[PDB]
A paper describes a structure:
The nucleoside proton symporter (NHS) family proteins are part of the major facilitator superfamily and are responsible for transporting nucleosides from the extracellular environment into the cell. In this study, using X-ray crystallography, molecular dynamics simulations, and biochemical assays, we discovered that the deprotonation of Asp323 in NupG, or the equivalent Asp315 in [name], (another NHS family member) triggers a local conformational change in the TM10 region of NHS transporters. Further biochemical studies suggest that this local conformational change in the GXXXD motif plays a role in coordinating substrate release, ultimately facilitating substrate translocation.
We introduced a point mutation in [name] ([name]) to improve the quality of the crystal and crystallized the protein using the lipidic cubic phase method. Through molecular replacement, we determined the structure of [name] at a resolution of 3.1 Å. The asymmetric unit, contained two [name] molecules, designated as molecule A and molecule B. Notably, both molecules were captured in nearly identical conformations, with a RMSD of 0.17 Å across 332Cα atoms. Notably, Lys267 is located in the loop connecting TM8 and TM9, which is distant from the substrate-binding site. This placement ensures that the mutation has minimal effect on the substrate-binding region. A structural comparison between two NHS members, NupG and [name], revealed that both proteins share similar structural features, with an RMSD of approximately 1.57 Å across 316 Cα atoms, despite having only about 27% sequence identity.
Author numbering:
A (entry chain B): 1 to 187, 193 to 403
B (entry chain A): 1 to 186, 193 to 403
């Protein structure tokens, strides 16, 4: 029970619980009678909570409560709120409980990486090694949810609420484990996220980056709300655990990434992630698992998801850091996260969801598919292509 | 993972939770600057929740919620409320969260009895078996709290909050364990008493109601002052050694039926009374300075359970015997709500400010910050006078 290894367990569980439910959710909702647009709103809960929680963390670190004491009760509230949500037959009863849970979860991200940062001897020695534990625990929820139950004699739980239950149980666990976590002190103008960072848009490169990133987030939201549903509808078994190849891919390919970034330069690497997200979505157009070649395309798409994340998200953060004034880089990160990764995420979810029910929903299933999945992946791949070319020509740097 | 045993674990943890924090709370509250009165109110919280709880259980099921799901929700709520309370530094912050926790909790008791009752095949065979598991869990909390932390190299937790955190953790556990629980399905506030209020016109029933109302006020002295006294008298692991009363209740249950058939309910009721009196006398004279004092201390813990069985169960038996068969459960609810509930409330607070105002030592001497032996005198002959008042004023058949 060493203090640093304590930190690692709490990181692991913290992202374990978000994973346990985020990935399977579509299958249980479509099967329990939701429609594409209801489901889109359900995944939009995520983006709303993301953009709204800096406010909440102003509330939640401002007051004298130290982070570990807070995380215990936010975790307990989350277990309660989502158990309640998990028992919901309807969209009307289900949605507000998901939004409530989401609001009490997303501050914990900050809480937990605060407690890791404060109580670790060397930041560059231990912080990275703590924060990959988050990815590890995402993996663990995935394997627990797509592989473990079948190992004990049960069938795929993805079309059922048990993932919703796993997350609740894990919340409960992290709650109790917050007793044994070291003391972490906390650390009032609401306008910090935006106004600090809005006047950085005047630089041309920064604006093209900002708005092409914001466009990026909307097709890229298709993956998180549809990949598992489609993967299983097209015949891949244990899809919710096989999707951890994107996580393993991120982890392992990022060692290869810095040597990339040196040899080619940020504009090349920024659009390289773009092109492999395009390629990946194409793989999802044509893959359908009946034959080994289409199956291989499925797996390769998941791989290049982690490749694509490493190419774009991490260098993007770097770019903002080297490109922003030091007092203001935390502000700018807050900002691009806020709209790009928050409003672009919401746009992605609901654009895609109502677009599916309006233009793709099958009236009666054909060959196991109740959606023209290939068609939507193709929409998104095409749109990635043409936002990508704009960024190729509308922006340049050295 | 069988319906047979799943309920047993449920009852175990369910009363484990009440036990964890209830016995030790005095030590920590007192050792964090509280006063005897604020402590009295704190123990009174649980009685208030008991008082107000049928209201909450009459709104729990009316909206068609399955007992196991709502229980999961309530255990989670109690975990959170208990953590908050446990991080509290003064009575003003501590009290409201305790009251909230308790209100979340004591509907759980009913709920868990519902869930247990529904899903055993033979209820008169297998219900008692689940009922003992609650007291066994209460035993487990005692032991785990006043014995296990020394085993791991840590000093006594009874003066710290940790009981409070142990409570939170077990709340969270039973909460999660409610997922695996079998399915148990489910508006006049007046129903709990007015049914039974008209029963009081029998004079024996009034005498019994009134004198158990009196009896329950001294009787609360034990729960609120016993651990503090026992430890301040130098008994170590007191919080664990106090489970002997629980044990003795369990084992003395087998000698109860043959006791209750041999002299009736008058003698056996006041036998409950008398053993509670004399064990209070043992409390007035025991200490650990000498071996014999020590022997008194342990015997007084045993006589708790003996006194409890006698009174608490043959009284229930008496009202069932004495109540019309629709109204018997209403009758239960009434005497448990005012006698066991209001009497407890007034015992806790009466004693709290009693010791605050007329028993607090300016400067602790011989380890004692109170004239404990004085309070036990007060209580023991309060028991005595109520005992004789009962002695002549109550007739049987
Ligand atoms: C009151 C009116 C006065 C005018 C108001 C401000 C002028 C408008 C432009 C401001 C850029 C502000 C920062 C100027 C320097 C920016 C450089 C920067 O962004 O960081 C450098 C980084 O290394 C990249 O390579
Ligand atoms: C929300 C994070 C929990 C962290 C632990 C907090 C530490 C101090 C707690 C409460 C002081 C306010 C007293 C509240 C009075 C009752 C509230 C209704
Ligand atoms: C680090 C991995 C920890 C593993 C955590 C696993 C949590 C879910 C396990 C089994 C689901 C139960 C399925 C039962 C179906 C009814
Ligand atoms: C250590 C973190 C990993 C595990 C943490 C929580 C473990 C899973 C909890 C509940 C699964 C309940 C499944 C429900 C089965 C009944 C239907
Ligand atoms: C009935 C008893 C008190 C009044 C309850 C309501 C008013 C609270 C004042 C009494 C109180 O509990 O605080 C001081 C008391 O003398 C020790 O704490
Ligand atoms: C204690 C509850 C046990 C679980 C039973 C769930 C039954 C469905 C809930 C309906 C009300 C929804 C309220 C949503 C308000 C936000
Ligand atoms: C007998 C039932 C077994 C349940 C086990 C939980 C009981 C409490 C656990 C640890 C308390 C000691 C922690 C001391 C750390 C200071
Ligand atoms: C089920 C049983 C769960 C018991 C959880 C006990 C936690 C005590 C640890 C206390 C550490 C904090 C000291 C202040
Ligand atoms: C200012 C106080 C006014 C009086 C308040 C009344 C309450 C009782 C008071 C004192 C009894 C304490 C005396 C305890 C006897 C000590 C005897 C002793 O010295 O040791 C024991 C024995 O001798 C070993 O062999």
């Amino acid at each position: 029970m060493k203090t640093t290894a304590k930190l690692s367990f709490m990181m692991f569980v913290e992202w374990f619980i978000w994973g346990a439910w985020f990935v399977p959710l579509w299958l249980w909702l479509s099967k329990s009678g939701f429609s594409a647009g209801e489901i889109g709103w359900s995944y939009a809960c995520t983006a709303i909570a993301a953009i709204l929680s800096p406010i909440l963390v102003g509330s939640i670190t401002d007051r004298f409560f130290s982070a570990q004491k807070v995380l215990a009760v936010l975790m307990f509230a989350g277990a309660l709120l989502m158990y309640f949500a998990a028992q919901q037959t309807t969209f009307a009863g289900f949605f507000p409980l998901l939004l409530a849970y989401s609001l009490t979860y997303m501050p914990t991200i900050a809480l937990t990486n605060s407690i890791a940062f404060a109580n670790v001897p060397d930041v560059e020695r231990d912080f990275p090694r703590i924060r990959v534990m988050g990815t590890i625990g995402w993996i663990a929820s995935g394997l627990a949810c797509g592989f473990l139950p079948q190992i004990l004699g049960y069938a795929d739980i993805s079309p059922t609420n048990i993932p919703l239950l796993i997350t609740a149980g894990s919340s409960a666990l992290l709650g109790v484990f917050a007793f044994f976590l070291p003391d972490t002190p906390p650390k009032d103008i609401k306008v910090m996220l935006g106004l600090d960072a809005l006047i950085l848009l005047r630089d041309k490169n920064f604006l093209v980056f900002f708005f092409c990133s914001f466009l990026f987030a909307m097709p890229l939201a298709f993956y998180y709300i549809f990949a598992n549903g489609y993967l299983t509808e097209v015949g891949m078994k244990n899809a919710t655990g096989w999707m951890t190849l994107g996580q393993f891919s991120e982890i392992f390919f990022m060692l290869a990434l810095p040597f990339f970034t040196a040899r080619f330069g940020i504009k090349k690497v920024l659009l390289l992630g773009l092109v492999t997200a395009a390629i990946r979505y194409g793989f999802f157009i044509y893959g359908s698992a009946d034959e080994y070649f289409t199956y291989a395309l499925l797996f390769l798409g998941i791989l290049l998801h982690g490749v694509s994340y490493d190419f774009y998200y991490v260098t993007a953060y770097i770019y903002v850091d080297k490109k922003a004034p030091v007092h203001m880089r935390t502000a700018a990160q807050g900002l691009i996260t806020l709209c790009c990764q928050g409003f672009g995420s919401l746009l992605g979810y609901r654009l895609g969801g109502v677009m599916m029910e309006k233009m793709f929903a099958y009236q009666e299933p054909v060959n196991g598919l109740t959606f023209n999945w290939s068609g939507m992946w193709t929409f998104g791949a095409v749109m990635i292509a043409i936002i990508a070319v704009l960024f190729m020509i509308f922006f340049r740097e050295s």
